[PDB]
Amino acid sequence: VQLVQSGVEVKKPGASVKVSCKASGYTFTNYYMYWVRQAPGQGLEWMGGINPSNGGTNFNEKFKNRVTLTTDSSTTTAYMELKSLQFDDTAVYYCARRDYRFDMGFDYWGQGTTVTVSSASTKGPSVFPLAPSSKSTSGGTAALGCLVKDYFPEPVTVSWNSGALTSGVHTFPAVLQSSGLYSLSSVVTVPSSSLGTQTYICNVNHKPSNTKVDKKVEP
Amino acid sequence: EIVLTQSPATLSLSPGERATLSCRASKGVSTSGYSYLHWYQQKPGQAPRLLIYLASYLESGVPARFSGSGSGTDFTLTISSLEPEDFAVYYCQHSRDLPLTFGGGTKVEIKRTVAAPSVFIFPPSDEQLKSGTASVVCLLNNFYPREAKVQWKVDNALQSGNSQESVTEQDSKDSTYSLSSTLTLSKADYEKHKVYACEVTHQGLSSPVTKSFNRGE
C-alpha cells in the first residue's frame, strides 16, 4: 500500500501548481482521499477531500476558491491543483487516505510535495568566511564557518573538507530574509591550536543554480 | 471551526519515562459515545503517522505503549514508557464537523543536564563589505535547554528588526542545541558605528555573556 506524490515545485505568484498522488485500485474503492499542507515551521492545515467513487468533494472554506480536486480512476491517481499562488502557499502538501466506511483516521500519508512560491528567481549563493579569531575562541576551542547568503530556492548542501570533517559541525536551517532570498550558516569547532596546522574548506552545492563553490576559511 | 489546543508545547523527558500529552477542543467533538479525535506522530522531514483513532483505538502496527483517552473537550495521549524512537512531534486532529482541524503540536524532547552555551562572534568578511552589506554573526554552541536570549547591541543601542536566528535540531549525540543569529546592516550603517556586541542570556550562565569587537580591529 503506497501513496506516491509528485516532486518539488518552485512557482511565481499568480501561477498554478498541480500536485499528483498515485494510489492503488484498493485505495480507490475503499478510501476517500484528503489533502493537508504544512507551512515551514508550522503545523498541519486541512484543505479538502474527494470521493474517488463519484468525484464529489469537500473543502476548507479558506481554500475553496483556489483549489480544484480531481481523480483519474483509470490511473488511480488523485490531483490537487492550486491556482493563483500566493507567497504563503509555500508549504509541504500531503495527500492522505481515510477508510470510506467511517473516519478511522488518516492511516496512510504520501511522502509530501514541497511547493515554494516567490517572486524571487533561481539564484546561486554568495559564500563568505566566518573567520576564527580570539573573539571566536573559548578555552582551547575555536569556532569557524561559512556564511551561505542570498540564494533561491532551497536547498543548499554544505560539507567540510570534502566530507572528511563531520564531528563538531553544525549547519543551521536557513532563514528567509526580507529580500526573499535564503541564508544559512555552517560552523565547526576545532582545537584552537589547530588553526595554524590545519586547512579548513567549506564545500557548498546549490543544484538549482548549478553552483559548486569551495571556500578556504583562514584565521 | 472547532479549534484544538495542545499542551504543553514541549515536554522534556528521559527514555523510560511516562509521557502524557493533552488535547483540548473549543467545543465538544463527541457524538453518541463516539469521539472524532485522532493522534499522529511526525518526525523531521517525514509525513505524519497515525497512532490513535477515534480517541481510544490503537492503530494496527503501533506499539502497545501508546494509548489514547478522553471525550467531549478533553483528550490525552499517553506513552507508558518512552523509547528513543518516540521523541518526535505529536498532533491531534478532529472530524466532528467541517473544517477538519489539527492541534498546534507537542514536541517531546530529550531531557539532559543544563549546559551553558559557548558564545562566539564573527565580524563581517572584507569580501562581503565590498558588496555594500555587512553581516555580523553570533553563535551559541552546544547548550541546553533550548531557551536562550540573544540581543544585538551597536554602540550600546539595542537592535530590533534587523536580525534573524536559526536553531539546530537536538543533537543526536549529546542532546544539546546550537543557535546562530545574524545581524544585517548596509555597509554605510556598519561603518558609522564602532562597537558590535551580542549579549547572551541562558539559565546555564551565572550572568549574561557579552561578546564584542571594534570595527576595524
Next chain:
Amino acid sequence: PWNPPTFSPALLVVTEGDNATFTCSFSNTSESFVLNWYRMSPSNQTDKLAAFPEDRSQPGQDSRFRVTQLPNGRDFHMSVVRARRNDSGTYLCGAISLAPKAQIKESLRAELR
C-alpha cells in the same frame, strides 16, 4: 459477538417524489460498531450513501439519503427522500467493528424500484 444486520423489505416500490424507507436492524450494545447504508454500483461495488452515526467528513455527501436510529436502539430507518428514476437498484446495510478495525458484516441485499 456478533451477527450481520438484517435489511427489510426485500422489495420496496415507489415512483417519484415519494420517500423510500428501508429498515436496518442490528442488535447490539456497541461495543462500538458503526453502520453503513450502501447501494450496489454499476461495477458491483458497494457505494456508501450514509453512516450511523453521521459521517460528516464524507466528501460528496448527498443529503437525500438519511439514517435515523429508532427508540428501541436496534432498528434504523434508512430513507431516500424524494426518490428518483435512477435511484432504483440494489441496496444493503453493513455493520462495521471499530476495534478489529477491519471487520464488516453485510446484510442480505434488497431491491428498490
